[PDB]
Amino acid sequence: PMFIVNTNVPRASVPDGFLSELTQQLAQATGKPPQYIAVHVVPDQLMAFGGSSEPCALCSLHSIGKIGGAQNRSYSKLLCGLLAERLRISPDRVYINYYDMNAANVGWNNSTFA
Amino acid sequence: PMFIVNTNVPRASVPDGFLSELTQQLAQATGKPPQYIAVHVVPDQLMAFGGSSEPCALCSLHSIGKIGGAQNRSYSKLLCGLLAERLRISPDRVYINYYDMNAANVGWNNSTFA
Amino acid sequence: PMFIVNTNVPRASVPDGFLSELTQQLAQATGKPPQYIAVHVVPDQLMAFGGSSEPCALCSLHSIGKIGGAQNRSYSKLLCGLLAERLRISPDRVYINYYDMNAANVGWNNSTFA
Numbered sequence: 001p002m003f004i005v006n007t008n009v010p011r012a013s014v015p016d017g018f019l020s021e022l023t024q025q026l027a028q029a030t031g032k033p034p035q036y037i038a039v040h041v042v043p044d045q046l047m048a049f050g051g052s053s054e055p056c057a058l059c060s061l062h063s064i065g066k067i068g069g070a071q072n073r074s075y076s077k078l079l080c081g082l083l084a085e086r087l088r089i090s091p092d093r094v095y096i097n098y099y100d101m102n103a104a105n106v107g108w109n110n111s112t113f114a
Numbered sequence: 115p116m117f118i119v120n121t122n123v124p125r126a127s128v129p130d131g132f133l134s135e136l137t138q139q140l141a142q143a144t145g146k147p148p149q150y151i152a153v154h155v156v157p158d159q160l161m162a163f164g165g166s167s168e169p170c171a172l173c174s175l176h177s178i179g180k181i182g183g184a185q186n187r188s189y190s191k192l193l194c195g196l197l198a199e200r201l202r203i204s205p206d207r208v209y210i211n212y213y214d215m216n217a218a219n220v221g222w223n224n225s226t227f228a
Numbered sequence: 229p230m231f232i233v234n235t236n237v238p239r240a241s242v243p244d245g246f247l248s249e250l251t252q253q254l255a256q257a258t259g260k261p262p263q264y265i266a267v268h269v270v271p272d273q274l275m276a277f278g279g280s281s282e283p284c285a286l287c288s289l290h291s292i293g294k295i296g297g298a299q300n301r302s303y304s305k306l307l308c309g310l311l312a313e314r315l316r317i318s319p320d321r322v323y324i325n326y327y328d329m330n331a332a333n334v335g336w337n338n339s340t341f342a
């Protein structure tokens with residue numbers, strides 16, 4: 001999987017361990033081993049959510065399978081929990097876009113997963 | 115909805131008011147309530163369009179519905195007009211990717227919109 | 229097409245001309261005219277891949293058609309090759325997400341394609 005977070009929280013307020021925490025927790029939640037999981041956090045962003053510039057996050061989670069109605073409901077609890085605790089973002093200021101990727105449309109190591 | 119703009123124009127050329135203006139204009143264009151609209155502007159990017167580094171923008175608009183042939187033409191006129199007037203970007207150096215998101219694939223506040 | 233690379237390698241490590249090279253090589257690979265190819269490179273990112281903070285990249289290639297099984301394997305070879313030779317990123321630390329876009333969902337020049 002690949003998990004991306006864009007946030008207006010400043011870089012100094014992103015804990016140094018956050019990437020590693022996300023990687024480990026996503027491995028558990030998706031059932032995918034952590035060596036396959038990539039995480040990207042982008043702080044200091046110029047953003048607004050409902051017209052307000054209080055802390056917020058726009059995220060995406062891409063996975064080959066392990067995406068669906070029930071699974072996505074669970075991931076949102078996990079990820080809102082993490083963003084709330086580590087970045088102090090209110091969970092009603094978090095969007096997460098979920099993407100079920102076809103293996104043919106994911107490149108890696110000179111090839112694709114198809 | 116959520117609207118993201120990535121651009122090579124400098125941060126100082128982004129008007130005060132710009133995020134609020136996008137929020138309001140998108141509320142009106144989509145009919146969606148402004149409290150659920152997120153906007154994200156990323157200036158100072160290293161970009162090329164047609165191999166040229168003149169002002170350009172790469173954007174995305176995600177919505178649960180309100181996406182399609184005619185609506186997307188209307189959004190493009192709206193949003194290129196805004197990028198031209200406020201950021202001085204020529205409409206032929208703007209791409210906007212539209213995404214009709216399934217509600218089950220949009221997480222918010224410990225759940226999804228499904 | 230549009231091609232986006234996010235990487236933790238420093239800005240100084242991106243060689244002069246890299247966005248021109250990507251534009252030219254993507255024109256040859258996709259058959260699309262270079263004047264319509266957009267490229268966006270984002271260095272100095274906070275990222276991890278498999279829990280390691282060693283050089284890595286997360287990319288996307290969007291195209292209206294010219295996306296599929298064999299074509300994507302060819303794009304991955306090309307692009308991993310360039311990231312390795314120009315940015316010194318190991319191909320096994322690169323993910324590329326491929327998107328076949330509907331023309332009606334791509335805005336440009338105050339309208340959309342068809």
Ligand SMILES: COc1ccc(N2Cc3ccc(O)cc3OC2=O)cc1
Nearest residue numbers: 001002036062063064101106323325
């Ligand atoms: C070999 O096992 C695996 C395990 C996980 C994956 N990956 C890696 C991956 C990369 C990009 C992306 O958009 C989604 C994505 O999701 C997966 O399931 C790929 C192969």
Ligand SMILES: COc1ccc(N2Cc3ccc(O)cc3OC2=O)cc1
Nearest residue numbers: 095115116146150176177178215220
């Ligand atoms: C008032 O109810 C609403 C209004 C708007 C929405 N949202 C929010 C939203 C978030 C992420 C995304 O990718 C798309 C998206 O589109 C919507 O329609 C959801 C519920």
Ligand SMILES: COc1ccc(N2Cc3ccc(O)cc3OC2=O)cc1
Nearest residue numbers: 209211229230264290291292329334
């Ligand atoms: C010369 O005519 C052309 C050449 C290329 C395109 N484009 C531009 C483009 C923009 C955004 C995007 O997500 C995909 C995309 O793919 C294309 O094929 C469209 C028309």
